[PDB]
C-alpha cells in the first residue's frame, strides 16, 4: 500500500487511500468476494458435520441447511431430510470457488494492475463517467436478472423447492402455472408494512413468489439492456452527487434497506422460510398453543364454543376485530396468521366448530413440536425458553437469530449511509476537510436577532 | 481423544499460517 | 351491523386505497406539485 | 333536590347555567335529567 | 368518514411532493461552498 | 384489644408471623408452635389444606376491650390475623382527624432523615470551601503564570 | 383541585420555553 | 453427519470459521508490522 | 476441613439426575432437581420434596395408619380415590358462579382422571397407580398433574403424591415425574 | 433474545440446584412475570 | 348474503370485510310463516347479529326512555354456531331451546355523556314459547367475568386478596360492597323472536329479535342496567 | 441556534454546565438514598389508593407497579432474606392467571 502523509489518510481510513486505484479497489473487491464465498462453504461444511437425522431440522443450530433445504435439495414428502449428500458437494463447491476467488483478490491486490484504464479502457474508470457507470449497472442487473431466471429455472423445470401448502403437510411440488401478473405482483410491492397485510412479507404462496421472480428478472434484465445502452439525464445529474463516496452512501443505504426487510422476512415467514426447516415464527408456538389447548380440552369433555375465559371473551375463542371467529388465547394479536396447519381447519365466516369437532386430522394433531419446545424464545446463552425458563434444553430458534444479527448490521448500515452521506455531499461541495477559517458563510449572513 | 488432538492441531496449523507469511515477507525482503 | 365502517383494513388495498377518489386526488396533488416545479424550474 | 348548587356557594356556575349550559364532562346534569352530548360546550369545555 | 382520510392523504401526498421534488431540484448546489 | 390467640381445630397454639420493617405487604400466615406452615389466607382460595374455614382456627384474646368472646366462623378470624400480624390489636378512630390509613413517619425518622440529608450536603460545602481557601491564588487570579 | 394545577404548570413551562427559544437575549461574544 | 468417505477430515473441518475474523485480525498485524504507516 | 486436591481429569459421578433414598419401610428414588421443604398440608406427611424452580413441582408420602389388610380391601380404584379426595385442595369460595366456562355450575375447580393400574413389584401386593389432571378456573400452569401410588405394608397406607404443573409436565418434567413414580417402592 | 440466563447453572457433586445470585434474578424475574398481565393469559406459557 | 354464496369464498377475501359478523339472510324464501310443516326439527347453526344497542336509564323524576348510543366495540357482537330445537304444530306453538355455541359476546358501549357500560350479549338457556309471530321467553345471563377475574387492587371472589392491601387500616363495615360481598349471581333476561322469511325446500328461517338482558354488574358493586338490543338472526333447520 | 433554538454562547458556561449536570443528579440521588435509608419511600399516591379502593374501574400503569411490587417482595425475599426464615406456601405467594 501506500502511507498517510501522501494520501492523506490514517491507517484506520486506509481503505479510501485506494479510493482512487481501481486495480486495488478490484484486489479488495474479490478478496472480499472470496471472504463471503470462504464463509459460505465452510458453514455449509459445519452444517453437513453437525447433523442429527432423526430429529426435525432446527434444533442443531443450523442456519443455511435451511436455505439449501428451502430448494427442496433432499427433503421428504412430510419434511424428511432423507439425504445430506447435496448440502454437502453445495459446501465443497463453494468453497474451491473460495479458493480460486481469493487467489484472484490477492493477485490483484498485490501483482495486478495498479491503475486500470492506461492498458484496459473497459474495465478503467474515473468517477465521473456516468456512462460507463452506467454501463456497469447494467452488467449487475443482467447478472441478477440472470439469476432471478436461475430460480425460475429451478421452480417450473428442474422438479424443486418445497411448498408448505400442500395437502397433508406440504410437498417438493415442481410449480406450474406461476402467478406472473402485473395486478397482484405490483400490489403485493405497494401495499401496507403493517399487521393488516403486510409489505413485502405477505407472500403466501409460491406461485406467487416465482411470478414475482419473473418481473424482477426481466425487469433487471432489460433494464441492464437500457443502463448499458443510456446516458444519465441532466435532472439525474443535477439531484445527485456522482463521486466514489457518494455511491457508497447509496449502495449503504439501499442494502441497510434489504437488511431490515431480510430480517423481518426471517421473523415472519412461514412460506419462503419453511417453519419444518426453520423453526416457527412469531405468530405461531402461540397459536400452536391456541390450538393444543382447544383439542386437548374438546378432548377430554368440556365444550369450547360456550366456554368462556376470566375477561369475558373466550378462554379458547373469541371473534376477532374483523366478524371472523379466532383464537381465544392471548394469541388474538396474531389472528393474521397462515400456517401450513389452519387452512384445513379455516372456515369461510368463522373456524367451523363442527369441522373443529369432528374434521380434525392427525397431522394437525401431531404438528405440536411446535408447541411444546422450540418458541422464538431461547435466550443469548441458549437454555430454554422465557428468561425465567431453567437450564433444561439447549435451543434458539436461528429465525430470531438471524434476524437480529441481520437487522443489527443492517441498522449499523444505516449509520454508515449516513456518514458517507453527509461526507460525499461536503466533500462535493468543497468542505470535507473543515471550514476554510478565512471565510466562513456564517459571517456572511445575517444574525438571527 | 484422537478427533480433539486432530481439532487442535489443525487449530494451530491453521492461525499460525499468517503470522508466518507476514514474518516471512518481512525477512524475506518488503513490499507488504 | 350497528354502525357504518370503513371496512377497508386489511384486504391487500395498494397504498390503503379503497375508493378511486382518494387515487385521483393523490396524483392530482402530486401532478399539481409537479407541474409547478417543471414550469418553475431552471430557477427562473 | 335537597342539596341544591345554591346551597354549595355557587357563585358563577349559575350564571353560567343561565343561558344554556347544564351538563359537564362528569356524566351528570344540576336538574338530574340523563346526560345527553354537550359538544365542546360544557362547564369544564367553557372553562378551558 | 371517508373524508378526513381523502383530506390527511392529500396533505401527505402534497408534503411528500414537496421533499420528493425538493432534493430532486438541485439540491447539493445549495451550498455556500466553491462546488 | 388484647392478644390474639389462635387455636387450630383440634386445638394448638398458632402464631402470626410479623411485618417486617422493609414490606410494604406482607403475607398473613399462621405457622405452627415449632415453626411449620399451618394455615394463611390464600391467594387462589382453591387448593391445598391452609384455608381457614376448612383448618378451623379461633381467635380469643385475653386483654382490655376483648377478653373472652372467641370466634371461629365468620371472617372476623381473618380481620384479627390481619390486624394481629402488624403486632398488637389496637382500635383507632380515623374520623377526628380524616385519618387515612397509611403509615407516617416517626419525629425520629423526620430528624435523622433532615439532618442525614444537611450533613452530608455540609459536606459538600467543607469540601468546597476548602477548595475556595487552598486554592485562593486559582480562584482569584495568577496573571498569565 | 388537583388536574388545572398540572396543566399550568406544564404550559407555563412550555411557554417559558417558547420565550426563551424566540425572545431570547441576542448572543454576543461568537 | 459427513459421508464414510470424508468421516476423518471432519476435525480438520471443525475449526474454519474463525479464519475469517483472523483475515481481519491479521490486517492489524500488517498494520503494526508497517508499524502504522 | 481435611485437604484434598481438586477434581482434574476425574469424570462425573451423577449424571442420571436422581438420589436414593431410605425411609422408615419405604424407597423412593427422589430428583436431585428437588430439594426438602417442611410444608405439611396434611399432618401424617413424613417426607417432602418441592423443586427450587417451581415448588409446585412437589412430592410428599404419608404414613396413615389403617384397618384394611390389604388395598384390595379398599375396593375398587375408583372408590378408593373417592375415598381420598381431599388431598386435592377444597375450594374457600361459595359464591354462585356460572361464568367460569367448561366448568360445573357454582365451581371452580376440577380433576380429570387420566389413568388407573395395579401394577406389582416383588411380592405380589398391587400398586394402585393413578394421573390426575387437576384443571382450575385460574389456569395456573396450565393444570396440574397429579401422579398418586398407594399400597400398605403392614397397618400404615404409603400414599405417593407427585404434582407437576402442565407446563412444566410438557417441558420434561414426565421423565422425572415417571421415575420417581416407578421408584416408589414398599420394602 | 433475552440476556443471559445463568438459573440453574451452579451444581454440586450430587447435582443439587446450588443458589446463585443468578438464581436471586431469576426468582425476582418471575415474581415479576407472575402479575405481568394477571388475567390476559389463558395459557401458560407466555410467547404472544 | 345468503349463506350459500358465503360458503363459496376464500377465507381470505372475507378476512377484513367484515362479512362474517353478517348474519346470512334468505331470497328464495316465502313469507307465509305459517306454511312451515309441523312437527320436530333438529336445526344447527343458529346465527345472531345485532343492529342496535340501546341502553336503559333511569332519571330521577319518574318516566322511562330508551336513547341511542356509542360502540366501543369493534366487529366482536354476533353469536355464531348454536345447535338446538324447537317442537312445533300446526296452529304455531313452539318449544324453541338452544343447546351450545358461541352463545356470548364481550361489548363495550358509552351513553351520551360518557359513561362505560361494558355487557356479555349472552342468549344462553333461551326457552322458546308461543306462536310463529311472536314467541318470547327467558334466557340465563352469566355476570360477565369469571370468579378468578382480579380487580387492580389484586383483590377478586375466587382468587384474590378481598382485602385492603394498599391501606392497612380500612376493613369496617364499609367496604362490605366493595370486598365482602364479590357476587356473581347470574341474572336473567328476556328476549322476544318473530319468524320471517321463511324456507320451504331447506328449512331457513332468519328473523329479527329484541333482547331485554341485563348489564354486567362489575362485581357486584353497582347495580346493572337494562339494555334492550335489536337486530337480525338466522337458523337452518334439520 | 437553529436547530435546538437556543444554543451556548459561552463555553465557560458550556463547560462549567456539562460539570454541573452530573454532579448535581448524583448529589441529589445520593439524598434520595439518604431517605431511604430510613424506609422513607416514594411508595403511594393517597389519591391514587383511594380511587382505586373505591372504585374497582380505575386504575394506571402506576398501579399495575405496585402490585407488580408486591410481586416481586413476595417471591424474592423468601430466599433473599434466609435469617427471615420465610417457608411461604405457593397460594400465599401471588399469580396472575395461567402463569
Ligand atoms: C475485507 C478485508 C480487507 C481487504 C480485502 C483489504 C485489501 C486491501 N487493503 Mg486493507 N485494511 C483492512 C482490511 C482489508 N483490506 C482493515 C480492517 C484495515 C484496518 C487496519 C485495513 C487498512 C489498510 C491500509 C492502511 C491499507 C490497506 C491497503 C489495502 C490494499 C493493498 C494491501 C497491500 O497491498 O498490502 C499487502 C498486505 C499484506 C502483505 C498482508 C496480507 C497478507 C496476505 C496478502 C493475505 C493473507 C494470506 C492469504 C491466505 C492469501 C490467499 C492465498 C490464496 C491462494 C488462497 C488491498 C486491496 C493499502 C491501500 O489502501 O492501498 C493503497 C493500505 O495502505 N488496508
Ligand atoms: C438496483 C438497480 C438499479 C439502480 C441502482 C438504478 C439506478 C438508476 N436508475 Mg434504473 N432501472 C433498474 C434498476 C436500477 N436503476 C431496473 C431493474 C429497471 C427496469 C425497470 C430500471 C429502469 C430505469 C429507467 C427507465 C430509468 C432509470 C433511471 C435511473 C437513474 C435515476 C434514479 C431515479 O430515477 O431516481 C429516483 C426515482 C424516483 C424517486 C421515482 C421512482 C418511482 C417509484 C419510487 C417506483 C414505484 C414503486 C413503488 C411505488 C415504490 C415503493 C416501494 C419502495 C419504497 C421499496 C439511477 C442512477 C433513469 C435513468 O436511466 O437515468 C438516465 C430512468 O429514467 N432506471
Ligand atoms: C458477518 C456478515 C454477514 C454474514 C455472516 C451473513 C450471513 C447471511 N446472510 Mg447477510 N447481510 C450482511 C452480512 C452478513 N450476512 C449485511 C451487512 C447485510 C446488509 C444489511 C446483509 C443483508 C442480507 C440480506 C438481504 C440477506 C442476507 C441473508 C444471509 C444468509 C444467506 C446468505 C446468502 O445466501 O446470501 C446471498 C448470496 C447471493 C445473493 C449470491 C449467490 C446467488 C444465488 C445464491 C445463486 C442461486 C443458486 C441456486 C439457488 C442454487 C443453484 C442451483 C443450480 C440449478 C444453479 C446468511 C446466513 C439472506 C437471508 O436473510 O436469508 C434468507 C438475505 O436475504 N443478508
Ligand atoms: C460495505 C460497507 C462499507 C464500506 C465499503 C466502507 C468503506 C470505507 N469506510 Mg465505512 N462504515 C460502514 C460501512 C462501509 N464503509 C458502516 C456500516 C459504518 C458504521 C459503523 C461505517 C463507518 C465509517 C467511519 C466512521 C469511517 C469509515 C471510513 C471508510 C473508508 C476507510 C475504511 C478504513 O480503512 O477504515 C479501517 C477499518 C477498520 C478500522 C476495521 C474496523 C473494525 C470494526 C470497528 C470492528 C467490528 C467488527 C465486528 C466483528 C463486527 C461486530 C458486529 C456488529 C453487529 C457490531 C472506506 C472507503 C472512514 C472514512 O471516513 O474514510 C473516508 C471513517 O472514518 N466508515
Ligand atoms: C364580587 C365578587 C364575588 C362574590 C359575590 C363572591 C361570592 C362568594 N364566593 Mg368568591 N371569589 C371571588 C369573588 C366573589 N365571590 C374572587 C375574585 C375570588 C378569587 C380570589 C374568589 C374566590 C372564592 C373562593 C376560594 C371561594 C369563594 C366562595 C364564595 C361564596 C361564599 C361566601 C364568601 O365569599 O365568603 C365570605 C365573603 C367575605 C368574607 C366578603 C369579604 C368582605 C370584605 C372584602 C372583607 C374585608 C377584607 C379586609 C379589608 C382585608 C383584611 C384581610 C386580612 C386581615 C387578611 C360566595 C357566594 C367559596 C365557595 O363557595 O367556593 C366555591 C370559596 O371557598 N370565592
Ligand atoms: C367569545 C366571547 C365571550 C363569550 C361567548 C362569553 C360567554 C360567557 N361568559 Mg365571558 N368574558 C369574555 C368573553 C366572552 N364570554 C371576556 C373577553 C371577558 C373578560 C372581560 C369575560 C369575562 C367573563 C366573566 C367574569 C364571566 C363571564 C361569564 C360568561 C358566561 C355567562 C355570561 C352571563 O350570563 O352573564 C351576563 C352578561 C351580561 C349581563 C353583559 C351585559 C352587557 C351590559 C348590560 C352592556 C351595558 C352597556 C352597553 C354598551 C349598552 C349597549 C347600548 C345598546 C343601546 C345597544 C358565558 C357562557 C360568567 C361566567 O359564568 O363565567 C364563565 C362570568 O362570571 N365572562
Ligand atoms: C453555615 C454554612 C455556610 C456558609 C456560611 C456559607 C457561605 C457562603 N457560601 Mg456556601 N455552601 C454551604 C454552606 C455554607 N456556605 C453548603 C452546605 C453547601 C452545599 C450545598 C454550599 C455550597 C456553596 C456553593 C456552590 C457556593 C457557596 C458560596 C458561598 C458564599 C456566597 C453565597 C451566598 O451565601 O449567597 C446567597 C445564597 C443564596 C441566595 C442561595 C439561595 C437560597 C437557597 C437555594 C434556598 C434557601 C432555603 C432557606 C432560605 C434556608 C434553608 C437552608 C438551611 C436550612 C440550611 C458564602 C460566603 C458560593 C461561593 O463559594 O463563593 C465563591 C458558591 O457558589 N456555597
Ligand atoms: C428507513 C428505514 C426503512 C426500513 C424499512 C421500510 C420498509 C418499507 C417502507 C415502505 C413499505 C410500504 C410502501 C408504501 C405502502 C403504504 O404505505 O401504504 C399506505 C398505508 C396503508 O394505509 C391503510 O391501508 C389499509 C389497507 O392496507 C387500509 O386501507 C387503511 O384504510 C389505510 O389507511 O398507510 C401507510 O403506511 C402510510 C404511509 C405514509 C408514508 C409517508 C412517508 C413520508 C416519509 C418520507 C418520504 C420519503 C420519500
Ligand atoms: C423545531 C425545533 C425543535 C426544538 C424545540 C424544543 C427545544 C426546547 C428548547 C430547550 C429548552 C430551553 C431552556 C431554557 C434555558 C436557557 O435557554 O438557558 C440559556 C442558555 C444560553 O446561555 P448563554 O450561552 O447565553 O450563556 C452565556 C451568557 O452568560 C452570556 O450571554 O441555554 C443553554 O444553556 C443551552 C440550552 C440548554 C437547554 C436545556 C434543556 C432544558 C430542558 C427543558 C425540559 C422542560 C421540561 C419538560 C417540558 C414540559
Ligand atoms: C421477487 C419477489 C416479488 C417481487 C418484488 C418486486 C417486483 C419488487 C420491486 C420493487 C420496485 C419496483 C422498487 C422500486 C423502487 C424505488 C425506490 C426504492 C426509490 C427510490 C429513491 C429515493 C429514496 C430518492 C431519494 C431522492 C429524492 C427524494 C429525490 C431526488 C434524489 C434523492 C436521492 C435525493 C414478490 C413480492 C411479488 C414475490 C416474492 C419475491
Ligand atoms: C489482500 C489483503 C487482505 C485480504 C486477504 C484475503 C481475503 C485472502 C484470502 C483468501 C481466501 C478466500 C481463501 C479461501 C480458501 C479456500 C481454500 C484454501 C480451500 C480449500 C480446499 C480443500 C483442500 C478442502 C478439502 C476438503 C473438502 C474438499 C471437503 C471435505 C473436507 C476437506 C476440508 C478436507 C488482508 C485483509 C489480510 C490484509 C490487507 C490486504
Ligand atoms: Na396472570
New binding site residues.
Given amino acids: 500500500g501506500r502511507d498517510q502523509e501522501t494520501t492523506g489518510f490514517a491507517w484506520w481510513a486506509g481503505n479510501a487511500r485506494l479510493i482512487n486505484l481501481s486495480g486495488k479497489l478490484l484486489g479488495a473487491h474479490v478478496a472480499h468476494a472470496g471472504l463471503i464465498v470462504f464463509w459460505a462453504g465452510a458453514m455449509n461444511l459445519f452444517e453437513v458435520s453437525h447433523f442429527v437425522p432423526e430429529k426435525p431440522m432446527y434444533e442443531q443450530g443450523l442456519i443455511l441447511l435451511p436455505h439449501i433445504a428451502t430448494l427442496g435439495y433432499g427433503v421428504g414428502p412430510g419434511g424428511e431430510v432423507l439425504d445430506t449428500f447435496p448440502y454437502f458437494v453445495s459446501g465443497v463447491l463453494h468453497l474451491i470457488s473460495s479458493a480460486v476467488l481469493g487467489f484472484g483478490g490477492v493477485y490483484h491486490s498485490l501483482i495486478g494492475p495498479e491503475t486500470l484504464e492506461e492498458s484496459y479502457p473497459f474495465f478503467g474508470y474515473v468517477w465521473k463517467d456516468k456512462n460507463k457507470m452506467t454501463n456497469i449497472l447494467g452488467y449487475h442487473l443482467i447478472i441478477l436478472g440472470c439469476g432471478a431466471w436461475l430460480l425460475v429455472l429451478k421452480a417450473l423445470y428442474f422438479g424443486g423447492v418445497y411448498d408448505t401448502w400442500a395437502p397433508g403437510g406440504g410437498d417438493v411440488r415442481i410449480i406450474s402455472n406461476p402467478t406472473t401478473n402485473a395486478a397482484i405482483i405490483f400490489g403485493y410491492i405497494v401495499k401496507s408494512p403493517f399487521g393488516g397485510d403486510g409489505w413485502i412479507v405477505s407472500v403466501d404462496n409460491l406461485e406467487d413468489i416465482i411470478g414475482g421472480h419473473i418481473w424482477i428478472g426481466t425487469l433487471c434484465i432489460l433494464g441492464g439492456i437500457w443502463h448499458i445502452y443510456t446516458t444519465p439525464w441532466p435532472w439525474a445529474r443535477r439531484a445527485f452527487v456522482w463521486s466514489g463516496e457518494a455511491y457508497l452512501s447509496y449502495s449503504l443505504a439501499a442494502v441497510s434497506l434489504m437488511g431490515f426487510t431480510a430480517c423481518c422476512f426471517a421473523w415472519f415467514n412461514n412460506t419462503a422460510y419453511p417453519s419444518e426447516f426453520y423453526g416457527p415464527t412469531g405468530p405461531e408456538a402461540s397459536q400452536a398453543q391456541a390450538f393444543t389447548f382447544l383439542v386437548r380440552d374438546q378432548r377430554l369433555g368440556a365444550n369450547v364454543a360456550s366456554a368462556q375465559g376470566p375477561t369475558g371473551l373466550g378462554k379458547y375463542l373469541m371473534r376477532s376485530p374483523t366478524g371472523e371467529i379466532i383464537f381465544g388465547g392471548e394469541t388474538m394479536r396474531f389472528w393474521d396468521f397462515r400456517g401450513p396447519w389452519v387452512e384445513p381447519l379455516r372456515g369461510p365466516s368463522g373456524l367451523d366448530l363442527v369441522k373443529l369437532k369432528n374434521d380434525i386430522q392427525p397431522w394437525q394433531e401431531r404438528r405440536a413440536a411446535e408447541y411444546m419446545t422450540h418458541a422464538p424464545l431461547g435466550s443469548l446463552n441458549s437454555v430454554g425458553g422465557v428468561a425465567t425458563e431453567i437450564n433444561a434444553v439447549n435451543f434458539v430458534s436461528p429465525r430470531s437469530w438471524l434476524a437480529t444479527s441481520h437487522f443489527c448490521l443492517g441498522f449499523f448500515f444505516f449509520v454508515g449511509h449516513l456518514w458517507h452521506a453527509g461526507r460525499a455531499r461536503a466533500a462535493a461541495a468543497g468542505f470535507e476537510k473543515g471550514i476554510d477559517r478565512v471565510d466562513e458563510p456564517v459571517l456572511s449572513m445575517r444574525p438571527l436577532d | 481423544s484422537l478427533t480433539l488432538i486432530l481439532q487442535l492441531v489443525a487449530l494451530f496449523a491453521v492461525v499460525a499460517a499468517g503470522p508466518l507469511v507476514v514474518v516471512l515477507l518481512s525477512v524475506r525482503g518488503g513490499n507488504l | 351491523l350497528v354502525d357504518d365502517r370503513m371496512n377497508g383494513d386489511g384486504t391487500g388495498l395498494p397504498f390503503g386505497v379503497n375508493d378511486g377518489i382518494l387515487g385521483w386526488v393523490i396524483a392530482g396533488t402530486l401532478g399539481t406539485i409537479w407541474a409547478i416545479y417543471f414550469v418553475s424550474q431552471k430557477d427562473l | 333536590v335537597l342539596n341544591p348548587m345554591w346551597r354549595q356557594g355557587m357563585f358563577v356556575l349559575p350564571f353560567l347555567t343561565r343561558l344554556g349550559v347544564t351538563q359537564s364532562w362528569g356524566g351528570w346534569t344540576i336538574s338530574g335529567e340523563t346526560s345527553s352530548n354537550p359538544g365542546i360546550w360544557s362547564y369544564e369545555g367553557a372553562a378551558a | 368518514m371517508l373524508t378526513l382520510k381523502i383530506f390527511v392523504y392529500t396533505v401527505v401526498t402534497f408534503f411528500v411532493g414537496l421533499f420528493i421534488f425538493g432534493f430532486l431540484s438541485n439540491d447539493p448546489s445549495r451550498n455556500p461552498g466553491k462546488g | 384489644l388484647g392478644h390474639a390467640s389462635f387455636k387450630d381445630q383440634e386445638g394448638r397454639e398458632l402464631f402470626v408471623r410479623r411485618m417486617p420493617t422493609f414490606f410494604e405487604t406482607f403475607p398473613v400466615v399462621l405457622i405452627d408452635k415449632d415453626g411449620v406452615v399451618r394455615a394463611d389466607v390464600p391467594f387462589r382460595k382453591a387448593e391445598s389444606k391452609y384455608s381457614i374455614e376448612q383448618v378451623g382456627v379461633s381467635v380469643t384474646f385475653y386483654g382490655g376491650e376483648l377478653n373472652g368472646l372467641t370466634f371461629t366462623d365468620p371472617s372476623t378470624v381473618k380481620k384479627y390475623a390481619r390486624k394481629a400480624q402488624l403486632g398488637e390489636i389496637f382500635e383507632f378512630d380515623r374520623s377526628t382527624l380524616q385519618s387515612d390509613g397509611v403509615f407516617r413517619s416517626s419525629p425520629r425518622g423526620w430528624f435523622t432523615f433532615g439532618h442525614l440529608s444537611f450533613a452530608l450536603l455540609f459536606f459538600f460545602g467543607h469540601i468546597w470551601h476548602g477548595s475556595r481557601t487552598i486554592f485562593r491564588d486559582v480562584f482569584a487570579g495568577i496573571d498569565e503564570d | 383541585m388537583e388536574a388545572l394545577v398540572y396543566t399550568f404548570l406544564?404550559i407555563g413551562?412550555?411557554g417559558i420555553?417558547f420565550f426563551?427559544?424566540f425572545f431570547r437575549?441576542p448572543?454576543?461574544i461568537a | 453427519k459427513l459421508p464414510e468417505a470424508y468421516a476423518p477430515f471432519s476435525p480438520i473441518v471443525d475449526v474454519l470459521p474463525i479464519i475469517p475474523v483472523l483475515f481481519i485480525l491479521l490486517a492489524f498485524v500488517w498494520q503494526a508490522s508497517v508499524s502504522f504507516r | 476441613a481435611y485437604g484434598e486436591g481438586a477434581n482434574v481429569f476425574g469424570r462425573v459421578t451423577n449424571k442420571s439426575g436422581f438420589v436414593p433414598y431410605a425411609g422408615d419401610s419405604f424407597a423412593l428414588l427422589l430428583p436431585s432437581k428437588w430439594n426438602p421443604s417442611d410444608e405439611k398440608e396434611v399432618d401424617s406427611i413424613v417426607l417432602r420434596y418441592a423443586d427450587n424452580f417451581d415448588a409446585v413441582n412437589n412430592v410428599y408420602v404419608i404414613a396413615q395408619d389403617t384397618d384394611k389388610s390389604s388395598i384390595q380391601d379398599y375396593g375398587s380404584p375408583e372408590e378408593f380415590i373417592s375415598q381420598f379426595g381431599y388431598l386435592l385442595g377444597r375450594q374457600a369460595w361459595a359464591g354462585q358462579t356460572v361464568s367460569e366456562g367448561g366448568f360445573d355450575a357454582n365451581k371452580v375447580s376440577s380433576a380429570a382422571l387420566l389413568g388407573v393400574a395395579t401394577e406389582k413389584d416383588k411380592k405380589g401386593k398391587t400398586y394402585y397407580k393413578f394421573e390426575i389432571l387437576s384443571r382450575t378456573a385460574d389456569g395456573n400452569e396450565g393444570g396440574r398433574h397429579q401422579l398418586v401410588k398407594a399400597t400398605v405394608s403392614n397397618g400404615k397406607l404409603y400414599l405417593l403424591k407427585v404434582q407437576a404443573g402442565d407446563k412444566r409436565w410438557f417441558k420434561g418434567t414426565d421423565k422425572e415425574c415417571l421415575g420417581v413414580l416407578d421408584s416408589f417402592t414398599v420394602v | 433474545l433475552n440476556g443471559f440466563n445463568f438459573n440453574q447453572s451452579v451444581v454440586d457433586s450430587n447435582g443439587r440446584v446450588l443458589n446463585t445470585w443468578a438464581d436471586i434474578i431469576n426468582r425476582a424475574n418471575l415474581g415479576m412475570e407472575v402479575m405481568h398481565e394477571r388475567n390476559a393469559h389463558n395459557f401458560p406459557l407466555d410467547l404472544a | 348474503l345468503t349463506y350459500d354464496e358465503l360458503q363459496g369464498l376464500t377465507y381470505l377475501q372475507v378476512k377484513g370485510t367484515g362479512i362474517a359478523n353478517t348474519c346470512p339472510v334468505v331470497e328464495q324464501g316465502t313469507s307465509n310463516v305459517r306454511e312451515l310443516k309441523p312437527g320436530d326439527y333438529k336445526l344447527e347453526k343458529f346465527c345472531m347479529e345485532p343492529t342496535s344497542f340501546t341502553v336503559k336509564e333511569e332519571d330521577a323524576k319518574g318516566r322511562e326512555e330508551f336513547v341511542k348510543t356509542k360502540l366501543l366495540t369493534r366487529l366482536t357482537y354476533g353469536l355464531d354456531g348454536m345447535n338446538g330445537s324447537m317442537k312445533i304444530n300446526n296452529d304455531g306453538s313452539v318449544e324453541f331451546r338452544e343447546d351450545e355455541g358461541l352463545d356470548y359476546a364481550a361489548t363495550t358501549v358509552k351513553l351520551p355523556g360518557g359513561e362505560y357500560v361494558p355487557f356479555l350479549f349472552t342468549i344462553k338457556e333461551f326457552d322458546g314459547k308461543g306462536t310463529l309471530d311472536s314467541f318470547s321467553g327467558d334466557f340465563l345471563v352469566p355476570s360477565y367475568r369469571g370468579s378468578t377475574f382480579l380487580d387492580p387492587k389484586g383483590r377478586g371472589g375466587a382468587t384474590g386478596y378481598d382485602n385492603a392491601i394498599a391501606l392497612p387500616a380500612k376493613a369496617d363495615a364499609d367496604e362490605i360492597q366493595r370486598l365482602n360481598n364479590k357476587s356473581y349471581t347470574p341474572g336473567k333476561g328476556s328476549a322476544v323472536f318473530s319468524v320471517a322469511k321463511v324456507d320451504t325446500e331447506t328449512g331457513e328461517i332468519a328473523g329479527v329479535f329484541e333482547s331485554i338482558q341485563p348489564s354486567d354488574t362489575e362485581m357486584g358493586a353497582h347495580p346493572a342496567k337494562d339494555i334492550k338490543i335489536t337486530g337480525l338472526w338466522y337458523g337452518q333447520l334439520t | 441556534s437553529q436547530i435546538?433554538?437556543?444554543?451556548?454562547?459561552?463555553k465557560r458556561?458550556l463547560h462549567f454546565?456539562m460539570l454541573f449536570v452530573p454532579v448535581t443528579g448524583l448529589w441529589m440521588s445520593a439524598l434520595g438514598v439518604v431517605g431511604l435509608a430510613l424506609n422513607l419511600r416514594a411508595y403511594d399516591f393517597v389519591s391514587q389508593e383511594i380511587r382505586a379502593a373505591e372504585d374497582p374501574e380505575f386504575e394506571t400503569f402506576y398501579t399495575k407497579n405496585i402490585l407488580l411490587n408486591e410481586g416481586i417482595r413476595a417471591w424474592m425475599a423468601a430466599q433473599d432474606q434466609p435469617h427471615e426464615k420465610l417457608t411461604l406456601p405457593e397460594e400465599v405467594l401471588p399469580r396472575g392467571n395461567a402463569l
Avoid: H, K
Fill in positions: 406544564l413551562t412550555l420555553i426563551s427559544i437575549e448572543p454576543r | 435546538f433554538g437556543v444554543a451556548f454562547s459561552n458556561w454546565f
